[PDB]
Structure formats: structure tokens, C-alpha cells
């Protein structure tokens, strides 16, 4: 169990997502709602979905038939969330593959400035202090001008970018040919695929921390006295980082629920895995913010303006640290194979969870064998053709729209609040803890009980209405505001998951006969 789950949610959310979410929200002030959500919400909801999966004989959508069948569409919300997550997560792996393929030459493309994609506003990082501030480092400009080929907005997609579509097709062929057409990581989990990631993260940590000027980067990482907690993007960003890095409004953990024994002690395992994930995120944060401190000390700019305040921070600071590392070709090869390994394990787990939930939703409607093989290809083709809209020149804009709205926004707060509310105030903390006592052995303490009852609903509704009364718009890299139609598209992406629960509530109320109180009573009794 643990071996396929310690790679299942220790992935790109810790080495790529938490870095720029910490960077976008001021570094030190991001960790306060991070740890508040982690202790009051994240490990409670982690144990909550794991036990919801383990108690029910099935998992995913139909696990809400043995627990409050009225709210059966938390599984459907999880399906929508994991579909959009699969799309933009695999285009992160596309960028990692594109970085890996450009690393095989001896001189790295982001090491020096005299390249074809570099504007005349470019100098090397060791020359920026000498020349006296409207100038670009080679890592940021390589990223935005060769990897992204970043355009002037989401309304100008330009052209579908060549060779990123081929990298996305490569990672999708790897995913389609190693999920159900073959086998996942089975015998390679020992001594590789699970400790080579942590050895590489330790190498990046002991490189970034020994870089000059890393102390001010750690000071930016751990001092809350900037980006003050009166603006709600920090709270909702940290809450969605918790609920994203744990895959815990996703249905994946409920899918790797039912694949456990009934009387299996899965509390110490869940706390160990959650503390391992939080330690991985926090240690990778030390690494990447030490590198950003080095970058700001080298370039002479401030730490908050040295790189991309958006999803390029793991693709700017980590390649920069590779550049200031001995034999940078070798270490870039290992680092982007590492990003591919984390992302591929997490994507295998998410697509396996989505496919397991979709075949538990429709058993024998799609015949196993002949038509089970067709469905994986259909899902991979659909998510690839909706992943090619992040490949284009205006592809980071659509990707950041997905990353803030599709599977890591108010949808995650909505699903977490509704899971905790359903369990606590319909299923009952007493009755659910009786089930937990039957399975684990002990009733969970006042932490889990009062977290599902009060703390995680209060946190989720508080941050949800806090990001609405003091509304802030989605901005990319602190300079590009999004248009009204892009904000509407992102809110439609969020509402495609949040409105899975009231839609199934009105569907189950319309499809059942009787008065409304008797209807609700029948629909909330577990089966």
C-alpha cells in the first residue's frame, strides 16, 4: 500500500507547486496558512478519505452509497477535478521532458546568453552586478522564450508550439503504455524511483544552501513580515496546496481506499505519509528559496522579483542551481528524469484512480478486456487534445488558469468542506468513529473529530468567503492581469466541479418519489 502511495502524492506538488505558491505569496507568510491547513484540515481530510475508501467495499463515486447517498456527487466532483488535474499535470511533465531533451548537449541552453532566442536585454548572471532593472537572466528568458515561447496574453495563443506537443505526446504514450497496457512500478520501487528522488532533492538542498546569498533566501522563506495575511490569496493558495499535494479532494485516495484490508491500521500510515509529504515540500522549499536567494544576490535584484511568480519557479531556480553545479549536463539529466519520475508516478496514481472510479461507476457498461483497453486510449486522447491548449504560445496563461481554478481552487475547498460536513453532520462523528474503531481499532481523538466537525468546515468556509468578500483577480507573474473572459472560463472550470454536488442533489431529489423531508431522509440513510 504505502509504496504505491508514497510516490502517489509526493510528486510535482512538492517540488514544483509549493515552491511557486510560496514565492507568489511572500514566502514567510505562506507557511502560516500552510501549517494551519495542514494540521487542522490536511491530515484530517487525508485520514477521512482514506477511511471512506477503506470502509466502503468500493471507492470513488459509489463510496457515497454506503455513506450518505444524497451527496453522491462528491465522487463526480472528484472525477472532474482529477480529469482537469491530469491534463495540466501532464503538461508539467511535458515541460520537464522538454528541459530534459535540451539538456543532452554539453553547453546547457539556460547557462549562457548568446543564443538565438535571447533578446538584447540579456546578460549573464555574473555580469549583472558589474553593469550598474529591465534586464533578463538567461534561465528566465530561456524559459519564457524557448520553452514557453510566451505570448502577450491568453487572447493571443499564436501557434501551437512545435516539439512541446511531441513531448506531451511522449509522456502521454508513456502513461498510456504503463497504466493498463503494461505494469506500473512494481520491482523498481526498491533502491530507485523512491529514494533517487529524495537523494536528488538532498543534492539540490546541499547545493542551494551552500550557494552564496542563500541566507537571505531562507529569510524570505521563513519570515512572515511581508505579504500580510489580510489578503486572502495566501489562505486559499495554502489550503489548495494542502488539498492538492495530498490529492485529497481528488478521489484518488478513496480509490486507494478499497484496495486495503478492512481491519487495517491506517492511521499511523496516513500520519507518516502526510508528515513525509510535508517534510518533502518544506525541505524542497528550503532548497529552491536558497537558490532564489543566490539568484537575487548574484543579479542584484530583490528576492521577490528575481524569478517567475508563477509556474516557472521550479523551471527557473532549479535549472539555475544545476548550472552552478559541477558537470551541469549530468545533473540536469538526473533532475529532469527526477521530475519525470515524480510526475509519472503521481500521474499513474491519478489516472489509475480516475479509471478505477469510472469503472466502479459503470461496471460492465464498458466491457473489461476489449473495451477496457479502448477507454484508456480515449481518455488519454481527450486529455492530450485538451492538453494541447497549454502547449501553445499563450499556453502558460491557460495552464495558470487551470492551476488556479480547475483542480486547485475553490473546488478543493468546496469538496473538502462538503466531505467533512457530510461525514460529521450527516454520517456523524460518533457513528463514523465507531466504524473507525471497528477497522483501525481506536476511535480517533478530539483532533480528527473536532477537525471534521468544526475546524475543517470553518477553515474552508472562512477562506471561501474570504476570497469573495475581499476579492482579488487572478494575475500571472504579478504583471499580466487576466481578461474577463479568461476569469469566466476559470470560474466555469471551478464550477464544473463545485456544481457536481447540487446537481446530483437536485437529480436525486427529482428522481425519487415522495415528500421532501421523507425524500431527504431516504437519501441520507447509508446503504
Amino acid at each position, epitope marked *: 500500500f504505502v509504496l504505491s502511495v508514497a510516490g502517489g502524492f509526493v510528486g510535482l506538488g512538492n517540488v514544483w507547486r509549493f515552491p511557486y505558491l510560496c514565492y507568489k505569496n511572500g514566502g514567510g507568510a505562506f507557511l502560516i496558512p500552510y501549517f494551519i491547513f495542514l494540521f487542522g484540515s490536511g491530515l484530517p481530510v487525508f485520514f477521512l478519505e482514506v477511511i471512506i475508501g477503506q470502509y466502503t467495499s468500493e471507492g470513488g463515486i459509489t463510496c457515497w452509497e454506503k455513506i450518505c447517498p444524497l451527496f453522491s456527487g462528491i465522487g463526480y466532483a472528484s472525477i472532474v477535478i482529477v480529469s482537469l488535474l491530469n491534463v495540466y499535470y501532464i503538461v508539467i511533465l511535458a515541460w520537464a521532458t522538454y528541459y530534459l531533451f535540451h539538456s543532452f548537449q554539453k553547453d546547457l541552453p539556460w547557462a549562457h546568453c548568446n543564443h538565438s532566442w535571447n533578446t538584447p536585454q540579456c546578460m549573464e548572471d555574473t555580469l549583472r552586478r558589474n553593469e550598474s532593472a529591465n534586464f533578463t537572466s538567461p534561465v528566465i528568458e530561456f524559459w519564457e522564450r524557448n520553452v514557453l515561447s510566451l505570448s502577450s496574453g491568453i487572447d493571443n495563443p499564436g501557434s501551437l508550439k512545435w516539439d512541446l506537443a511531441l513531448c506531451l505526446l511522449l509522456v502521454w504514450l508513456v502513461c498510456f503504455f504503463c497504466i493498463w497496457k503494461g505494469v506500473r512500478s512494481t520491482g523498481k520501487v526498491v533502491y530507485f524511483t523512491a529514494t533517487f528522488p529524495f537523494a536528488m532533492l538532498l543534492v539540490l538542498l546541499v547545493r542551494g544552501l551552500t550557494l552564496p546569498g542563500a541566507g537571505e533566501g531562507i529569510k524570505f522563506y521563513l519570515y512572515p513580515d511581508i505579504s500580510r495575511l489580510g489578503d486572502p490569496q495566501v489562505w486559499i493558495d495554502a489550503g489548495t496546496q494542502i488539498f492538492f499535494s495530498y490529492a485529497i479532494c481528488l478521489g484518488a485516495m478513496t480509490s486507494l481506499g478499497s484496495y486495503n484490508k478492512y*481491519k487495517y*491500521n491506517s492511521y499511523r500510515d496516513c500520519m507518516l505519509l502526510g508528515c513525509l509529504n510535508s517534510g518533502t515540500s518544506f525541505v524542497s522549499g528550503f532548497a529552491i528559496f536558497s537558490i532564489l536567494g543566490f539568484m537575487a544576490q548574484e543579479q542584484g535584484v530583490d528576492i521577490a522579483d528575481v524569478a517567475e511568480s508563477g509556474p516557472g519557479l521550479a523551471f527557473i531556480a532549479y535549472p539555475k542551481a544545476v548550472t552552478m553545479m559541477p558537470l551541469p549536463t549530468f545533473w540536469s539529466i538526473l533532475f529532469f528524469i527526477m521530475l519525470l519520475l515524480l510526475g509519472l508516478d503521481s500521474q499513474f496514481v491519478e489516472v489509475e484512480g480516475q479509471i478505477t472510479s469510472l469503472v466502479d461507476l459503470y461496471p460492465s457498461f464498458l466491457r473489461k478486456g476489449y473495451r477496457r483497453e479502448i477507454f484508456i486510449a480515449i481518455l488519454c486522447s481527450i486529455s492530450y487534445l485538451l492538453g494541447l491548449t497549454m502547449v501553445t504560445e499563450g499556453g502558460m496563461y491557460v495552464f495558470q488558469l487551470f492551476d488556479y481554478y480547475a483542480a486547485s481552487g475553490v473546488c478543493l475547498l468546496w469538496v473538502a468542506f462538503f466531505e467533512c460536513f457530510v461525514i460529521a453532520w450527516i454520517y456523524g462523528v*460518533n*457513528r463514523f*468513529s*465507531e*466504524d473507525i*474503531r*471497528d477497522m*483501525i*481499532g*481506536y*476511535r480517533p481523538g478530539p483532533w480528527m473529530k473536532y477537525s471534521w466537525a468544526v475546524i475543517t468546515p470553518a477553515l474552508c468556509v472562512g477562506c471561501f468567503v474570504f476570497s469573495l468578500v475581499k476579492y482579488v483577480p487572478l494575475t500571472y507573474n504579478k504583471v499580466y492581469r487576466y481578461p474577463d473572459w479568461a476569469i469566466g472560463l476559470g470560474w466555469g472550470l471551478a464550477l464544473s466541479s463545485m456544481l457536481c454536488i447540487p446537481l446530483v442533489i437536485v437529480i436525486l431529489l427529482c428522481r425519487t418519489e415522495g415528500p421532501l423531508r421523507v425524500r431527504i431522509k431516504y437519501l441520507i440513510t447509508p446503504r
Partner: antibody
Amino acid sequence: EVQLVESGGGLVKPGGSLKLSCAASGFTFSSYAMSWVRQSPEKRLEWVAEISSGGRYIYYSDTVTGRFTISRDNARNILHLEMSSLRSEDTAMYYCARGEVRQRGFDYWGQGTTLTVS
Amino acid sequence: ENVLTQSPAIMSTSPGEKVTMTCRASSSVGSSYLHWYQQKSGASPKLWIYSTSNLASGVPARFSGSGSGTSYSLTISSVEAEDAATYYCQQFSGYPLTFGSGTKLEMK
């Protein structure tokens, strides 16, 4: 103070019916999974039947599966154990035992109700 | 069921002498799910050692446990006069919960 008080002990005929009453106080009775553990007259201790915190998950021993009925009354905190078809090799000393955490076990026991079958 | 064969019941321990008893389970107990109980002379049993290593409330530190999986033991460092009792090991894992046999640790 946690103290489990049992009653209903006595002598019954073989195949008869008797109802025990483990009255409990000193803890939140609705949040602790009760059990009944009997002790044979040769002092070989034997678990009979447990019931979960809410009373939904009920287990019995293999010897007394089809004829013993454990029940609770969480309103006034009394544990019961219905017996029917009570055979000769069921005379014992029946303790009610509070075991909720499976890693802790029956950390609080009651007194004895000496049941004799003649 | 899980048949828990135990040490011979009647053993005579001199006061202040290090003695121990075993508990062999037929199946595999998870070693956080096996407990030891003490029943005095004619009184009710009480929990003594839980999860085969720990100690309950009021249990002296002279008592200790070891073993895992199949063979489980209770170890007494020095027997005092308040130890004339009968000890039952008890697995708690399988839903037919089974206590062990008696171990009437008596005196000389």
C-alpha cells in the same frame, strides 16, 4: 470513578433464558465499546460477545454465536446480554469488560454474576 | 478461533526471584493487539500489560513483555508478595477474541 456493576446472576435450568445487566457509570458509555467476558468454574477466562460504540457492530464468540444477544441502553448506561437455549456448558462467571481501543484492551472490568446451570 | 496455548499454570516462584511466562498463539497477532491480564485470588481480572510491551495504570515497573507475531512473553524482574495471581494473555486482533489459559503464579 469508572465502575462497572453487573446483575442478573442466578441459577437457571438447561435451555432456559436469563438476562444480565451490566450497569455502567464513570465514563461516557455511548463512546466505549462494551464486551462480555465469562470465566468458567475452572477459571479459564473466555470472551463471549462485544458490541461497538454505537451498537451497530456486534460480534460474538464461535461457541455462543447463534444463541446469545448483546444489547446496550446508552440513555441510562446499562449493558445487557440476552441468553436463550442456555446449555449445561455455559455456567460461568460473566464479566462485562470495557474494551474500546484494540491496542488497549479491556482496561476496566466489572464484578461477577455467578451463573449456574442445573 | 485463535487458540492461545500458554505456560503451565501452576508454578511456584520464590519472592524476589526473576521468573517469566510465555504465550504461544496459533495464528499471527499484530503485537500491538495482544494484551496480558491479571486476575487475583477470587477477584475480577484487570488489564496488566497492553500491546505486549506497555503497562496499565497501577502496574509495577517490575512487569515487562516481549515477543511478537506468534510467541509472546511476560517478564517479572523480582516477584513480591503481591504477585500471587493468575495471568491471562489475550490477543485482540481476530473478531473471535480469545484469552489464554491460566498461569497461577503461586508462592513456596
